[PDB]
């Protein structure tokens, strides 16, 4: 499936099985743009987080319960949700994916 292949390709499960990961299907500029949208607090209680005004196409990759390295296994869940990212630097760009509502 897409998750098993994309997680491998992106060097995410080549040396371990990453529990969860989200892939956004929007242009890189459109996601970078979220850093100047709705400001919200991050889970940890920080405030360099931003929620997108709109929902975006995303694919959630969840490791099955029986998954174990080297045989990593993922449950693929496609969806449209508002993304929340943590921004930092100059230019001000996303460095962390906080969540999808």
């Amino acid at each position: 499936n897409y998750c098993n292949q994309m997680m491998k390709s992106r060097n995410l499960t080549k040396d371990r099985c990453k529990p969860v990961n989200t892939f956004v299907h929007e242009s890189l500029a459109d996601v970078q743009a979220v850093c100047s949208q709705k400001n919200v607090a991050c889970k940890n209680g920080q405030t360099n987080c931003y929620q997108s005004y709109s929902t975006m196409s995303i694919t959630d990759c969840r490791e099955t319960g029986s998954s174990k390295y080297p045989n990593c296994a993922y449950k693929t869940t496609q969806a449209n949700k508002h993304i929340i990212v943590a921004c930092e630097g100059n230019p001000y760009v996303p460095v962390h994916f906080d969540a999808s509502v």
């Binding site: 994309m6 992106r10 956004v24 299907h25 994916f97």
Partner: peptide
Amino acid sequence: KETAAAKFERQHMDS
């Protein structure tokens, strides 16, 4: 090495 913004891209971007 790979910056935090570059890592975000390799890990979450699939335009």
